[PDB]
Subunit: 118 residues, 6 copies
Amino acid sequence: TTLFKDFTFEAAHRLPHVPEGHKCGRLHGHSFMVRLEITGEVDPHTGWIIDFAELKAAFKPTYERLDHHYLNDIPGLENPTSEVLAKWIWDQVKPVVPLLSAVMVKETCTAGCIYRGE
Amino acid sequence: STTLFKDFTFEAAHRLPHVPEGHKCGRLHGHSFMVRLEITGEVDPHTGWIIDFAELKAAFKPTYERLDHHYLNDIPGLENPTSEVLAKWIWDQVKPVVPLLSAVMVKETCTAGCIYRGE
Amino acid sequence: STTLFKDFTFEAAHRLPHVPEGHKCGRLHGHSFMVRLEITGEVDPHTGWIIDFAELKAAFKPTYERLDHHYLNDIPGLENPTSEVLAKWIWDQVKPVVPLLSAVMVKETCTAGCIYRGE
Amino acid sequence: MSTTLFKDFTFEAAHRLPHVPEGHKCGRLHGHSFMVRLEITGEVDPHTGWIIDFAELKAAFKPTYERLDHHYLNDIPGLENPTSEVLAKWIWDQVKPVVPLLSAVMVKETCTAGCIYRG
Amino acid sequence: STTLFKDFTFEAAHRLPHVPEGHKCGRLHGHSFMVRLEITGEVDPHTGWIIDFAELKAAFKPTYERLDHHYLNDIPGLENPTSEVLAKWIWDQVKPVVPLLSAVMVKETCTAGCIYRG
Amino acid sequence: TTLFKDFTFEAAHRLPHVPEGHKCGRLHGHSFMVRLEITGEVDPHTGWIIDFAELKAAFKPTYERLDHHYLNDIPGLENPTSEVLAKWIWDQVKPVVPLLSAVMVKETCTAGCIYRG
Ligand SMILES: [Zn+2]
Ligand SMILES: [Zn+2]
Ligand SMILES: [Zn+2]
Ligand SMILES: [Zn+2]
Ligand SMILES: [Zn+2]
Ligand SMILES: [Zn+2]
């Protein structure tokens, strides 16, 4: 059994290692989506792995740093690609949500990335 | 491998009986639930599919109609109708009539869900 | 003219008391209700908006909390909690605090809803 | 008239709001996947069966689209206060001269928040 | 006023016969069409609605079944099956059976549609 | 680490081997969605597995054959089910994008197929 919860955040970023003309090298932004996936045993009394409210509360500090912010200013996100961001979120969240099994980030509606700790 | 999926939505009430005193989910409420039935297997050389979606619909229909426009807590097995219990419950009803079923996902909201895989 | 809109979703149970005896909507059930609040007015040349989304949210919050994770039929005025009655009821609750309110949309499902404009 | 055609475009951009109080999160540098709906109202041509060709709407909007997409809005003349409202009006002022039948511009900063400008 | 609406999707093929040679829309293709029917009228104080969605569905069903899993150009009146032509045709089929019909919207794609008010 | 990109195309098709009168046997169409998934090592400098634009560029010829077309006329798609289409897309794209790890095709909003080689 796997549980997941989606969050949207509104942020700016730019990619520093792309060619001079490359549109993503310009200052821009996205309505980012991030899905946190957790895997574990469901408790027979509560009937869940954990409460969505506790997941929200555990993610909030990391969420607050991402939302309505410029990502490049955050340590670790100097090259804030989808891939880099997905792993960065794992690194922030995994220590406080041990059951975390994947982080998906969507940069746009049609484009995204899934990281699992590999 | 090849996997096929079909999504269904149903409109239902429920309440969580085993949450702390104030918890909002402990009150009588409801959701537009989404369920995805995932099936895995060999695709037939002639039909070009694993199963006919109409077979899947027909097999799921009795379970679907018990869930849709209903109060889930009245259904035996769903006395604690969390997304996790519900996904397993749907698996337990559907697996016997859809042997190739490989997962059941339920979403209570647009942003929150559960996947169950028979383990 | 310029119109601003903001969507909220709430998770609630309801049942319709005045449908024929077998009607599925007469059963206790629920929805992920979406409400859109429309605001029509002059754009302030300093702020560059008609109203801050954050202020609209703050103004709506009390009404939102009465609806979300609740059973609608127990709320005074929502004894017949159709989309149309709900849209008017929301208007009546919100208009005093949001005088520029120009419409309330309520969607019960992804494919079904109504719009009230104050008449 | 009777018939209104519309076409949606999405662009990825940064902005910040200069005239919000110090704390306000929209005053910080951020961004959105902006959506813009262009609405055209006019007589449907008996021969083509349309009001306008979407290809011509694309080409007429392209120069304005390219200025918005993957850009920082505040650097664009006229968008020093790049609210939804200001943006929708600004788009209207750029596009209306090249698309005379333009009847409305909608911009959504998020999937739940936007506005409509009608001239 | 109060306006009610209901959305349906149908899966159909079409092609546009009066576009220049080579135009992609002149080729045989298809869409997941979406049609919204809007109804405007007084809310009945007993039912608390303008009409039952079931009455609307049943009124539209015959037209829906002509459109769904069909090739539109073979339908009389849809020889030039643009969004605009299709919306008006639907209106012309449905208005006699749904007198309170106030608008028909058709979307060919997620990003493109039209609204007809006869 | 897995990267994905979605594309939509507007196409007609019909299923030739379904029973008499079956709706899917009639000429019809869909707004098809296709998701290309690629799995691989992220480069330490670029910070990606590949540029979305190279993937877009690699799929374009195949995309061009699918979009605003009748699928049955394309060799390999004479029985254009979701399952057949997903495998066909994989066979076109895999040789050009060797890190490709899955292809999902959604025929409708609520129905689709995932193929993994
Ligand atoms: Zn970007
Ligand atoms: Zn619930
Ligand atoms: Zn209901
Ligand atoms: Zn903003
Ligand atoms: Zn078309
Ligand atoms: Zn089909």
